[PDB]
Symmetry: D2
Subunit: 214 residues, 4 copies
Amino acid sequence: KDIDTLISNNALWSKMLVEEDPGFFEKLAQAQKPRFLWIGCSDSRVPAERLTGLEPGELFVHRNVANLVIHTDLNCLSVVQYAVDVLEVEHIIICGHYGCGGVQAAVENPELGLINNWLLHIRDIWFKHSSLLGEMPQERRLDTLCELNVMEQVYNLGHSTIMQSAWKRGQKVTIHGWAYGIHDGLLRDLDVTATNRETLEQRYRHGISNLKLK
Amino acid sequence: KDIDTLISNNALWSKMLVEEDPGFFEKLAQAQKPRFLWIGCSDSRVPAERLTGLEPGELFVHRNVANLVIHTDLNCLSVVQYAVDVLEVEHIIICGHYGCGGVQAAVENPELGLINNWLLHIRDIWFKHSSLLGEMPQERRLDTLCELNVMEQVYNLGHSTIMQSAWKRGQKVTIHGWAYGIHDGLLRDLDVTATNRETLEQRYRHGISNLKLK
Amino acid sequence: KDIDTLISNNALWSKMLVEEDPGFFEKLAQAQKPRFLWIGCSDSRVPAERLTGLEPGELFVHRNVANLVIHTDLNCLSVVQYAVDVLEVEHIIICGHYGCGGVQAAVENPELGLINNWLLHIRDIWFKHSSLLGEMPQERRLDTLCELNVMEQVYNLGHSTIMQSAWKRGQKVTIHGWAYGIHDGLLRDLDVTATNRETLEQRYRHGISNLKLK
Amino acid sequence: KDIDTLISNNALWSKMLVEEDPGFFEKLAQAQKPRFLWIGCSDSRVPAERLTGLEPGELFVHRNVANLVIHTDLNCLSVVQYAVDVLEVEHIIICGHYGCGGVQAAVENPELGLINNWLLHIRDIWFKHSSLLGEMPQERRLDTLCELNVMEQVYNLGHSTIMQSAWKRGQKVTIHGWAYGIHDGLLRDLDVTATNRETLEQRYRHGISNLKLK
Ligand SMILES: [Zn+2]
Ligand SMILES: [Zn+2]
Ligand SMILES: [Zn+2]
Ligand SMILES: [Zn+2]
């Protein structure tokens, strides 16, 4: 596919909607704030909308390499603060995916350029859970790192001043840590769901523990 | 819709694909690098995939508030460098949308919190094109700012060291500046398409000029 | 000078203080919060302490290339928020200097690498005041840009959510825009001193106006 | 001291130099690139120039809260890249200090606002060396964290793409990890000096080991 094909398909798509689904934009037209914030990877192997069946306008979205929530990344923090304080989303979903190019590159450590600096945050995670990973079969270590990465980002987001203050003033906002694979497009709940400061700490340890078993 | 509904729909969606479109993941399974990098707004009113008809895996995606390409935002720059130097995408599309909450908030200047700092980059653009905007009917100024914002981000991306070096070594990478509205989902080419350092400067002025007329 | 010379001189310096100025650390030992926040250039041609005669512990300091206050730079914003809200400094000084390597590089635009992205913020300023600069003798344009840069950073800092909220709750914090040259080490007040939202806007225009004359 | 006193003292200081040290700016006037890059804390309890006896113009300087080198902080990375690739400094010194307000705040975890996000990078370090710290007397844990922080930042800087590429092309650049206290102003070499990729890894482990003993 080339550029002209995208513009042409869009023009035809727009016209076809009139006599196939005229109310397609009805929801959009009506100022309806999203209830979910989705933080995913730029790889976007399978669109979040397709994975969940959500309609356009129901989710606010941020995507970066390897779906990271770095303590000091204002790009991501700005999306979160806007979503939590202004749009007042009720659920935040951090979703990783098996076979993520970013996660793999962080382990193999090839010389890719500027992106290597961003990826060092993942290597920090790999070092952190070294013992845990060496306790499992080799073929499952990369997929496990993918899950650990999501859990650590959920933990990071929960500790941001944004989430801490929201939960402190009693706002209802839940964080979820999910992952999916390209073999079946099945969402997998890493079970680190946090609804407040206490469950954040509890479920985090819970998630890590469920891996010690696995 | 609640969380349980998303997980349940996903499980059912995955199963249905087997006897409706078994080869859905065939493309994904095959390591196929995306040809397009899409930089859009976190609002994601209408998914890029739906707007263009692109299949999953064909595009690399980054989304932030008001689709900005700040000179010094490493989150966005990391996505671009990875896409250009590693995935070697051939087209980069920066797409804004009319009625963007970020653009509007930058003009009205309400006290929203941390996000206000991110939005000041848009106010800089508004000041920059003050004369141009005052030369057009009031009802069209916000939509025009939305277009100007996209053009300025295309300009910013083109001047990053990442794009400058890519074009310098003769790599084929094109940047496009688009915008769409919720009234019809029709993509609008702002005609600032840049294929090298020269066309970047030329098309930028061209885009601004086409507005002086409009 | 080499590394061993610095360590050796430090050891001797420390000893000499006992029988030359025994109370040197008395001030430091006593938890005394700084009253001034100094934001300067990494070039640090002449130390701020030497320029003003301030004693150690009296100033909090941040230095980056070309003393910039980018709307979205969390490094600088973190220093400011800490200084204003926690240390409660009463004066913030942004000081540039004539002949700054960063300012010059932004104009000449040589290919220096990663730093070029940081410097684009200065080129934005150069474009912004194009008419003003072309209205003055060529030999004075670079020095004028150096002053304009400081004024714009003062403006940027004043518009951050940090300063806006501080002034809003009635906190006493003043921002100053200074510059000095290596020909005499003489501080030059650009007269853009802001004590609140109103004076920020007024003095900014004032500073620009005094240049139209110059 | 107030603002008028700083401006007045500067004016008098400048004049006095003529008949006390007329050649004070001679060095500065002569375009002499610094040989050292100093990365320190914004606290700046004792100026680097006073600690080492270096003259103005001999050092390039960056200061932020708790002297951090975050993998993805473009402010700090820009200073380093400019210093290494353009100024070609030969030594980079990361210097922390005992009693650092940033380090302490990271441990006590008070609610300070935006700065708490920046400080989470230090808490990550505290968690990382939990076992090591619990193996030492309580009264020495905070000072030890101060040293561990410096060692980790040296490690971070060494792993940046900037340092990796410099050492790869055979450039001579050495990184040092120091710390000083307000009780005597005595510099303490943490002995993690790295001159290349190999010594970076070796000296890092060495530094941590010397603590296991201490
Ligand atoms: Zn991925
Ligand atoms: Zn938007
Ligand atoms: Zn400078
Ligand atoms: Zn400190």
